Design an enzyme around this catalytic site. Structure first.
Site, mmCIF file in Angstrom:
data_model
loop_
_atom_site.group_PDB
_atom_site.id
_atom_site.type_symbol
_atom_site.label_atom_id
_atom_site.label_comp_id
_atom_site.label_asym_id
_atom_site.label_seq_id
_atom_site.Cartn_x
_atom_site.Cartn_y
_atom_site.Cartn_z
ATOM 1 N N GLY A 1 6.172 -14.495 -12.011
ATOM 2 C CA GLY A 1 4.999 -13.681 -11.249
ATOM 3 C C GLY A 1 4.774 -12.402 -11.834
ATOM 4 O O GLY A 1 5.167 -12.012 -12.968
ATOM 5 N N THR A 2 3.801 -11.818 -11.417
ATOM 6 C CA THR A 2 3.175 -10.454 -12.037
ATOM 7 C C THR A 2 4.064 -9.147 -11.089
ATOM 8 O O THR A 2 4.222 -9.417 -10.265
ATOM 9 C CB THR A 2 1.592 -10.103 -11.925
ATOM 10 O OG1 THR A 2 1.178 -10.337 -10.744
ATOM 11 C CG2 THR A 2 1.248 -10.655 -13.130
ATOM 12 N N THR A 3 4.252 -8.037 -11.894
ATOM 13 C CA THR A 3 4.668 -6.909 -11.284
ATOM 14 C C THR A 3 4.082 -6.642 -10.099
ATOM 15 O O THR A 3 2.601 -6.726 -9.781
ATOM 16 C CB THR A 3 4.778 -5.732 -12.202
ATOM 17 O OG1 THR A 3 5.078 -6.316 -13.427
ATOM 18 C CG2 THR A 3 5.702 -4.755 -11.578
ATOM 19 N N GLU B 1 -0.518 -5.760 -9.918
ATOM 20 C CA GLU B 1 -1.003 -6.191 -11.258
ATOM 21 C C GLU B 1 -1.579 -7.479 -11.069
ATOM 22 O O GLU B 1 -1.069 -8.497 -10.541
ATOM 23 C CB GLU B 1 -0.182 -6.229 -12.145
ATOM 24 C CG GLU B 1 -0.619 -6.189 -13.545
ATOM 25 C CD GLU B 1 0.370 -6.885 -14.830
ATOM 26 O OE1 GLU B 1 0.065 -7.720 -15.462
ATOM 27 O OE2 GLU B 1 1.646 -6.525 -14.918
ATOM 28 N N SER C 1 4.982 -12.193 -4.979
ATOM 29 C CA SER C 1 4.958 -12.556 -6.262
ATOM 30 C C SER C 1 5.850 -13.946 -6.158
ATOM 31 O O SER C 1 6.631 -14.039 -5.768
ATOM 32 C CB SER C 1 5.420 -11.715 -7.231
ATOM 33 O OG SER C 1 5.024 -10.198 -7.095
#
Lengths: 249, 52, 222, 249, 244, 231, 212, 237, 242
Positions: free
Chosen positions: I28-30, I45, I73
């Site tokens: 996932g993204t932060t 993000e 995420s």
């Protein structure tokens, strides 16, 4: 037998192919199909089927693969014909449903689309429709028909759930040999007795006996006479007048 | 050429002068390198599609 | 204690012609003796030169406008833009009506349009289910006022050639689009004075092969 | 979803059903219990065991009450016994104290519980309960009766039997110790003496659980002033009564 | 998940054959023998217990023999748990027939009904069979005394002499040589005993290891007395025939 | 097969391979390109015939008189999703008397794939849809993947040789946004966009299928001698 | 309202009216009380207009689906007893139903069945159902001979409906005649009942009581 | 349970239909030959086993209506589920459509019955093949049909199914004629006995013959009768 | 085999499936959650994949009720199912008890749903981590929910690829401000550590989305930070990392 198949544990499971394997197998049961030829013209559609004699003690004039859906739509079955026992009832129901609700002759394309929506309903329970099948049908149809809105149309219905409108198509075992000849000999400037005689030309090549009316059957769908199954006496005449003109060579 | 590895790309450049030789030249046209894209890749077509 | 059928009045009127058809109706809505609104279409176009009006109990009469136009959608979709005919349309309406008969619609429904010959076509539905083609047919609460006058002028019912005294029968004259505009106006003039649930407004929709035209005439304010 | 409705018990290629063969081994990996049938009464006696010595043992029951005339005792699994005792009672009330408005005979109760085991042998999502039960009880018309219901779902009446891990040795000891008339006073001394050859553990009333389906006790009646009914014929023996009999061996 | 671990035991083999049915038939020759011998005056049902211990109580036991109704009793050989179930299914069916027509069931009808029940379990549902074999002795007026065996597949055939369970082949050979079309019940009792003396899977053959029952026309007024004997009446007729 | 033949499993990697497999439905798929400006959407789908005696099987389905979807991938899967979109489209017309919100309908679609990817004996759909329409917030292009990812883009493709289209759209991105009121140009930009994504398959007057939706022009599918004006 | 049918040599003449009333007000005077069950069966409409019309459309739906499956045209006794099993269901769910299914097949001959709203099904050679079935009977049974000729028979379909129309409050509108043959029904058109009056008044000498 | 017992095979079959045909091969042999005014189904019974009650046990020919007989080969146990469906349909036809069933309609029904247990989940096909023969009512044409576990139905002039059917089928090409049946009922019976004596052999007690004549007359000829018919064939041969 | 599913057990206390779900969330993204004095502040993000995208037109923070922010995420489609489910459960509670759901109550519910998906053969445990909070009348709370169905209270939580950069910096923020900080002041803090969490993700370019639920700015509703307030945050962070 025992040909590498990586996956095929689910009845819908993937497959590095990008398409299901089970659907593919269903199409490989139509190459064992007794050969059905169909030439569509703008003056009519001819459905010819080899009745298929198995024995001399089998009555081969009683058995036939011409099946009436209604008076304005005819249909031909090739493949595993037990599977077509269930669908052909469904299709006849369907037509009738349309005549109840709308009092109108159903489109050939619409009717074709309906047994495709039926054809896709293999599964263990998923989507909008409750699965009641579990193995895909292993049978293909040639729905011919005549409507007064788009004319003569002829469709090749797949166990896949796909329909391609053809201008002439043969399916069955001798499919490969048929479609070489259709490509050259077909055109849109045909007339009904030159097509009729074309059905018997190509039937002659995929014949595994010899050509006579005790193992071959013709049927038509005509605008002003409807769907008519040609009897054997009538069938005979044309087969002999092929044999007159092939002896003029 | 999109997502061609350096061995395939070596294999277009060679394959162009095959085509050149068969037309029968001595100089290698820019229309040959395009037809070496099809003839030699990595895969023979997009297979048979019946509804894909 | 609950009773889900009232009356909301109004009156509708269908006339088939020789290349036209006229489906009119009033635009008065009432509940008992109080005027709800002077302006309220009941005669809706529904596509493909079919005009519908479901008159009587208003809510019911909006219910079957709902489902009818829903069928216009699903027919065109799973037939890939097939034009739905007067003959076809009739029989669909009848299925929706009948399937509720243990809670029935309590309206008098009429459709009108052209047929495939290029002549008028008017079918009319009874409350529960079934229907029959007509050539003149009113419905609604002022039905029985408009109807005997219009058979006296369209079909000339029980009239004779003059000066023969019942020996010769008066021949049936042709129907112009201009002439049938007049009948609707004259009729709805008579309706108003003698019946208390027609008023305010008259809306004639004339339907041809050329298109749908609306035409609005005032009636009396009471 | 779920699709566990296929049997998980199947015949084995060599015959016999594997899952019930597994369950019976398990009964001989358990605690030891025995029952002796006397002329004028029935006794069952078993060992009480716990993880640690700091656990109680009065809050645990391995002689359990089905009816006021019928107790059960097990050898096998603790968890699996607990549920079936409850189901034994539930079916004894619903199918015989509602329809005859009284408690069932011992043979009739045996049979009911044998069906519950049976559907743990048939169908998916079950594996056999791994217990062997003794069902000793008294009914009026056949007198004193002792049964054994096994993992398989059959029942057997016996004249004296044991179940558990010390079983093979215990039935040999009781073969010479059985007599044609044995009194209930005498039997009590017998069962203790057998289970003393079978238990190493510190031998008090607090570790040996004793229950008799001896004779009726009008003091456990819970009411008086009815002479027509009589009290429980079951009577669970607490630590004090067993302590006198410890000393008399 | 679940489909992965699915046994699939109700599919055909390459032979067209059902492995679990055969496995059931294999395991019933691990249970005791039950024999039926049809005399002209009655039917003898003779069963040899698959258990025995001197500490066993085998005296209230009717662990092979069951009354389905007062005119048709069965001999059971196999897994007793599965069998118990069908036994109360059968009672429920008999009483149903009796409710609706107010006439006792013929032997033909009840044997067809149990058999169809079995057929269902091997046919679908992914279950294992009910591994039981019944010898039906019954009397009806329409076809008289009728003797029957059914197997876990769910197929029946009538017999004049039959054996099920342990040593089926063996008992069959014997029966064929010492049968006669018409016998008295006693001669039958004797024969019933004699076959089990030569087939017994322990050398000794005793009364307490016999369950033994008849249906006799020794009830006057053309009625049939179902008798399940007490083991002390078995003891005398076993000394009569001179086995013991 | 280690973890490959089962849609319920995982996977030491943390993917699953069943999703990746379904993404090959896109790969074997025929190219289709959608591009929108701000006043008009256009989907340009490259139809495919089986053979010469055969016709071409349409690849654009009228969902509404302001919405359309075109398939890439399996034809049976597409027919399931097209029905569903239509039912929820007519629901909004009936119940809320309202054109269906394009952005919302993308999440309805998402959850239908998700529930066949949760439960065993289900499948991931092998069709990715491009759904254009014009509502009250203007022109829209939704991109549907088998995974169930919904994204709104100025102009996108899916199909075989999708890469070649997408590099075209990066050039001509700033062109098509700025043509507005002239639906004609955006169509021309779509004919050229799919020319780049050919394998010398050419464009005939029954292979190329244009459909548009405007400010003022309902959803329409052109084919026949309509298309030849753009060809 | 009156629907009558009588078998004769030639087939069956069905003859029916076309006035369908609601209240004391007359709704429509142009209603067709013939329902094409197929070209080889004619169904009458009597009792509730909605109820009777509908289910005999769907009876025509099952007629085409007996016909394909057997590859043989539906028999008159099979249709009738379909329709009969359906209406027994809604027997006291408050619905009505009075039809005569009238047909002629090559292996069963002309046969009328009169299917009721209780699920009663009676065969017979003459039936008459309606609010003018008492007026109809009398005249129809006087002028009956089983051996009859087509012209004469056609005239009888008119004459009985006419009588019925004259005294009955809800009978009138127009009459229609059909003559069922084996090959199909052939339709014989529409006669106004009031213009018919003056013709037979002259010809017979009837209706002395009507002044003039 | 809704899991498949029918798993599609890449061969263009389903395994279980091929397995179901073998199961039919291993079954007892049935012959059908139709005359001009009769039908004749001869069937082998294994009566080789001794002390068999034969009186009380049903023949391997079952009447399903008053003029439609069904004979069968393959799984004997399984067959009885088909016979109970088919008897039930026969009444239903009288109830709702009136008249007795036609042989064709009943054959089609059977065809759809065996078919169903292929295509449905939770079930395996039946490995049972039927010979359905009989008369239509108001008619006197013998009509002889065969249905097979593939759920495929056929009309036949004469047919045989069961064990070593091929041996009898070759005989039937050569001693029965497509053009002419044997016209007396008696000769037709002896043609079928004469055929049965190829594989069955071992005396005339394992032969059973059911003869049906129109107008609803199903009678089964006893052993004694057969004995006389067989001996004739014996002497003449 | 015993390493393949959820209903299996293995004698190491591992149940390998569920642990594999964390590996999904790790792609996932932060996503961070800053717990402040007045409320909660989320930021995510959002990767800009291509210049073909229509910008600020995908929301990865979806509202549940009107007062519980939700940002997740892992698998994006899979997460959308979990949020839909918690919008059903919120709506059921709102009816039955006629108040907006408490956050310890919202916790119970979601918690149960994912736990469920480890006890059947026919289901897969969802591979998403959620971060959800808001203001209820017992005050602001914050919860992070593991794919294993594990959760705790949190004064700052994170998940994603750049959970490595983010965590160390959250320690820094509770040692900057161990008496907490304002929800307004925390907009600038969420910008700063989302930017630093793109140095484990610098193969692309990204867009920052920030949303807040704080009592004192939004009247206890879950709103987005938008317009000029949002670009002040972007600039702040942008200049520190340059």
């Amino acid at each position: 037998f025992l040909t590498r198949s990586e996956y095929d544990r689910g009845v819908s499971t993937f497959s590095p192919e990008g398409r299901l394997f089970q659907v593919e197998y269903s199409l490989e049961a139509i190459k064992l199909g007794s050969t059905a030829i169909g030439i569509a013209t703008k003056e009519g559609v001819v459905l010819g089927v080899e009745k298929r004699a198995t024995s001399p003690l089998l009555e081969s004039d009683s058995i036939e693969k011409i099946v009436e859906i209604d008076r304005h739509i005819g249909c031909a079955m090739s493949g595993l014909t037990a599977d077509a026992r269930s669908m052909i009832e469904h299709a006849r129901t369907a037509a009738v449903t349309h005549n109840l609700y709308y009092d109108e002759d159903i489109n050939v394309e619409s009717l074709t689309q309906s047994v495709c929506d039926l054809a896709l309903r293999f599964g263990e329970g998923a989507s909008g429709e409750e699965r009641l099948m579990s193995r895909p049908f292993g049978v293909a149809l040639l729905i011919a028909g005549h409507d007064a809105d788009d004319g003569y149309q002829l469709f090749h219905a797949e166990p896949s759930g796909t329909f391609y409108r053809y201008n002439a198509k043969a399916i069955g075992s001798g499919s490969e040999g048929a479609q070489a000849e259709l490509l050259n000999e077909w055109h849109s400037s045909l007339t009904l007795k030159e097509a009729e005689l074309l059905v018997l030309k190509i039937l002659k090549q995929v014949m595994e006996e010899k050509l006579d009316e005790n193992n071959a059957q013709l049927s038509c769908i005509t605008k002003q006479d409807g769907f008519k199954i040609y009897d054997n006496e009538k069938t005979a005449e044309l087969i002999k007048e092929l044999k007159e003109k092939e002896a003029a060579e | 050429t999109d997502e061609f590895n350096g061995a395939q790309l070596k294999a277009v450049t060679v394959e162009a002068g095959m085509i050149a030789l068969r037309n029968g030249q001595s100089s290698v046209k820019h229309e040959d390198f395009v037809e070496g894209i099809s003839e030699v890749q990595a895969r023979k077509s997009k297979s048979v599609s019946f509804y894909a | 204690q609950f009773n889900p059928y009232g009356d909301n009045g109004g009156t509708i009127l269908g006339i088939a012609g020789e290349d036209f058809a006229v489906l009119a109706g009033d635009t008065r809505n009432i509940t008992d003796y109080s005027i709800n609104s002077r302006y309220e279409p009941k005669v809706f176009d529904c596509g493909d030169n079919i005009v519908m009006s479901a008159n009587g109990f208003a809510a019911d009469g909006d219910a079957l406008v709902k489902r009818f136009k829903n069928s216009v959608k699903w027919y065109h979709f799973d037939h890939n833009d097939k034009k739905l005919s007067i003959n076809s349309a009739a029989r669909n309406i009848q299925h929706l009506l009948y399937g509720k008969r243990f809670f029935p619609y309590y309206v008098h429904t009429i459709i009108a349009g052209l047929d495939e010959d290029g002549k008028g076509a008017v079918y009319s539905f009874d409350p529960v289910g079934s229907y029959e083609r007509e050539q003149c047919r009113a419905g609604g609460a002022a039905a029985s006022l408009i109807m005997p006058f219009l058979d006296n002028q369209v079909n000339f019912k029980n009239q004779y050639e003059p000066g023969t005294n019942g020996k010769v029968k008066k021949p049936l004259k042709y129907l112009s689009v201009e002439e049938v505009i007049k009948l609707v106006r004259d009729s709805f003039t008579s309706a108003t004075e003698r019946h208390i649930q027609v008023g305010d407004g008259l809306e004639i929709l004339i339907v041809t092969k050329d298109g749908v035209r609306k035409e609005f005439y005032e009636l009396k304010r009471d | 979803t779920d699709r566990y409705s296929f049997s998980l018990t199947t015949f084995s290629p060599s015959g016999k059903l594997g899952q019930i063969d597994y369950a019976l081994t398990a009964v001989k990996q358990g605690v030891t219990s025995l029952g002796i049938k006397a002329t004028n009464g029935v006794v069952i006696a078993t060992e009480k065991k716990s993880s640690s010595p700091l656990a109680m043992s009065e809050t645990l029951s391995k002689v359990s009450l089905l009816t006021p005339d019928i107790g059960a005792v097990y050898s096998g699994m603790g968890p699996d016994y607990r549920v079936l005792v409850d189901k034994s009672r539930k079916v004894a009330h619903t199918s015989y104290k509602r329809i005859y408005g009284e408690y069932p005979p011992t043979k009739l109760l045996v049979s009911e519980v044998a069906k519950i085991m049976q559907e743990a042998t048939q169908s998916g999502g079950v594996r056999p309960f791994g217990v062997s039960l003794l069902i000793a009880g008294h009914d009026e018309f056949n007198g004193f009766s002792l049964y054994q219901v096994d993992p398989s779902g059959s029942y057997f009446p016996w004249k004296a039997t044991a179940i558990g891990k010390g079983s093979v040795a215990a039935k040999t000891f009781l073969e010479k110790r059985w007599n044609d008339e044995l009194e209930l006073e005498d039997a009590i001394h017998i069962a203790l003496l057998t289970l003393k050859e079978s238990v190493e553990g510190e031998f008090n009333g607090d570790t040996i659980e004793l229950a008799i389906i001896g004779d009726e006790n009008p003091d456990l009646l819970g009411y008086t002033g009815i002479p027509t009914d009589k009290g429980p014929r079951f009577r669970k023996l607490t630590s004090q009564e067993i302590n006198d009999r410890l000393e008399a061996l | 998940g679940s489909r992965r671990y699915d046994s699939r035991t109700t599919i055909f083999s390459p032979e067209g054959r059902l492995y679990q049915v055969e496995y059931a038939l294999e395991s019933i020759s691990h249970a005791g023998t039950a024999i039926g011998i049809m005399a002209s005056d009655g039917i003898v049902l003779a069963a040899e217990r698959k258990v025995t211990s001197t500490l066993l109580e085998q005296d209230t036991s009717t662990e092979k023999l069951y009354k389905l109704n007062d005119k048709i009793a069965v001999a059971v050989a196999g897994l007793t748990a599965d069998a118990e179930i069908l036994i109360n299914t059968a009672r429920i069916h008999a009483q149903n027939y009796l409710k609706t027509y107010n006439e006792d069931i013929p032997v033909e009808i009840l044997v067809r009904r149990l058999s169809d029940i079995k057929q269902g379990y091997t046919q679908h549902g992914g279950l294992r069979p009910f591994g039981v074999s019944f010898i039906y002795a019954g009397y009806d007026d329409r076809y008289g005394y009728q003797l029957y065996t059914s197997n876990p597949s769910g197929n029946y055939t009538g017999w004049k002499a039959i054996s099920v369970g342990a040593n089926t082949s063996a008992a069959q050979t014997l029966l064929q040589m010492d049968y006669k079309d018409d016998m008295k019940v006693d001669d039958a009792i004797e024969l019933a005993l004699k076959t089990l003396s030569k087939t017994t899977d322990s050398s000794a053959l005793t009364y307490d290891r016999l369950e033994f029952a008849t249906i006799r026309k020794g009830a006057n007024d053309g009625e049939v007395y179902q008798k399940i004997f007490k083991p002390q009446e078995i003891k005398d007729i076993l000394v009569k025939t001179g086995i013991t | 097969n280690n973890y490959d033949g089962d849609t319920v499993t995982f996977s030491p990697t943390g993917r699953l391979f069943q999703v990746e497999y379904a993404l090959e439905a896109i790969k074997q798929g025929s190219v289709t390109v959608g591009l929108r400006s701000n006043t008009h959407a256009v989907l340009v789908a490259l139809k495919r015939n089986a053979d010469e005696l055969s016709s071409y099987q349409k690849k654009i389905i009228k969902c509404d008189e302001h919405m359309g979807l075109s398939l890439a991938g399996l034809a049976p899967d597409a027919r399931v999703l097209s029905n569903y979109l239509r039912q929820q489209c007519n629901y909004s017309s009936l119940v809320f008397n309202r054109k269906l919100a394009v952005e919302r309908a993308g999440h309805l679609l998402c959850d239908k794939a998700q529930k066949n990817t949760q439960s065993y004996g289900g499948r991931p759909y092998g069709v990715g849809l491009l759904i254009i329409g014009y509502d009250k917030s203007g022109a829209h292009l939704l991109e549907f993947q088998p995974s169930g990812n919904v994204t709104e883009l100025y102009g996108t493709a899916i199909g075989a040789r999708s890469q070649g289209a997408k590099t075209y759209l990066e050039r001509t991105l700033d062109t098509f946004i700025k043509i507005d009121g002239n639906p004609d140009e955006l169509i021309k930009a779509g004919v050229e966009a799919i020319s780049q994504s050919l394998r010398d398959e050419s464009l005939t007057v029954d292979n190329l299928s244009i459909a548009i939706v405007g400010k003022d022009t309902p959803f329409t599918i052109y084919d026949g001698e309509a298309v030849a004006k753009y060809i | 309202t009156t629907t009558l049918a009588f078998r004769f040599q030639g087939g069956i003449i069905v003859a029916v009216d076309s006035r369908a009333t609601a209240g004391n007000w007359v709704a429509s005077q142009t209603v067709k009380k013939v329902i094409e069950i197929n070209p080889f069966l004619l169904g009458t409409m009597a009792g509730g207009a909605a109820d009777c019309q509908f289910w005999e459309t769907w009876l025509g739906s099952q007629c085409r689906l007996h016909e394909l499956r057997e590859k043989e045209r539906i028999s008159v006794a099979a249709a009738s007893k379909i329709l009969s099993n359906l209406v027994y269901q809604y027997k006291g769910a408050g619905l009505s139903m009075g039809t005569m299914i009238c047909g002629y097949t090559r292996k069963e001959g002309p046969t009328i069945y009169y299917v009721d709203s209780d699920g009663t099904r009676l065969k017979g050679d003459i039936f008459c159902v309606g609010s003018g079935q008492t007026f109809a009977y009398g005249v129809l049974d006087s002028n009956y001979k089983w051996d009859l000729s087509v012209e004469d028979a056609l005239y009888l379909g008119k004459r009985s409906i006419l009588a019925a129309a004259h005294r009955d409050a809800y009978s009138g509108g127009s009459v229609n005649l059909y003559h069922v043959t084996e090959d199909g029904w052939i339709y014989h058109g529409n006669h106004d009942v009031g213009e018919l009056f003056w013709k037979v008044k002259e010809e017979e000498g009837s209706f002395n009581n009507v002044i003039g | 349970y809704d899991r498949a017992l029918s798993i599609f095979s890449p061969d263009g079959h389903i395994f279980q239909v091929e397995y179901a045909l073998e199961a039919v091969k291993r079954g007892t042999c049935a012959v059908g030959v139709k005359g001009k005014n009769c039908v004749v189904l001869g069937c082998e019974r294994r009566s080789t086993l001794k002390l068999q009650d034969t009186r009380i046990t049903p023949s391997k020919v079952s009447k399903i209506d008053s003029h439609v007989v069904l004979s069968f080969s393959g799984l004997n146990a399984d067959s009885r589920i088909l016979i109970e469906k088919a008897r039930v349909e026969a009444q239903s036809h009288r109830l709702t459509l009136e008249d007795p069933v036609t042989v064709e309609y009943l054959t089609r029904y059977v065809a759809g019955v065996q078919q169903r247990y292929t295509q449905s989940g939770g079930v395996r096909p039946f490995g049972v093949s039927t010979l359905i023969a009989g008369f239509d009512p108001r008619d006197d044409e013998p009509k002889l049909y065969q249905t097979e576990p593939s759920g495929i139905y056929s009309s036949w002039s004469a047919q045989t199914i069961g064990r070593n059917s091929k041996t009898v089928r070759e005989f039937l090409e050569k001693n029965y004629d497509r053009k002419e049946p044997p016209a007396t009922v008696e000769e037709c019976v002896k043609l079928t006995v004469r055929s049965l004596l190829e594989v069955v052999q071992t005396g005339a007690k394992n032969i059973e013959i059911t003869v049906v004549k129109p107008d609803s007359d199903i009678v089964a000829l006893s052993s004694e009768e057969i004995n006389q018919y067989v001996t004739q064939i014996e002497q003449e041969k | 085999g015993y390493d393949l599913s959820n209903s299996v057990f293995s004698p190491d206390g591992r149940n390998f499936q569920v642990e594999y779900a964390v590996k999904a969330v790790e792609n996932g993204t932060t996503s961070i959650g800053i717990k402040c004095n007045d409320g909660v502040v989320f930021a995510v993000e959002k990767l800009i994949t291509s210049k073909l995208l229509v910008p600020q037109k995908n929301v990865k923070i979806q509202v549940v009720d009107r007062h519980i922010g939700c940002v997740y995420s892992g698998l994006i489609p899979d997460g959308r199912h979990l949020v839909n489910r918690g919008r059903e459960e919120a709506a059921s509670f709102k009816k039955l008890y006629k108040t907006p759901i408490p956050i310890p109550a919202f916790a119970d519910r979601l918690g149960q749903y994912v736990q469920a998906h480890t006890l059947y053969n026919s289901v897969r445990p969802f591979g998403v981590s959620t971060i959800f909070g808001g203001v209820d009348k017992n005050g602001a709370h914050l919860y992070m929910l593991e794919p294993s169905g594990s959760y705790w209270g949190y004064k700052g939580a994170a998940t994603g690829k750049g959970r490595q950069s983010a965590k160390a910096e959250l320690e820094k923020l509770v040692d900057h401000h161990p008496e907490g900080l304002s929800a307004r002041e925390a907009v600038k803090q969420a910008a700063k550590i989302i930017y630093l969490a793109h140095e484990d993700n610098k193969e692309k370019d990204f867009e920052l989305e920030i949303s807040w639920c704080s009592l004192s700015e939004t009247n206890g509703l879950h709103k987005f930070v938008k317009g000029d307030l949002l670009q002040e945050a972007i600039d702040f962070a942008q200049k520190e990392i340059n």
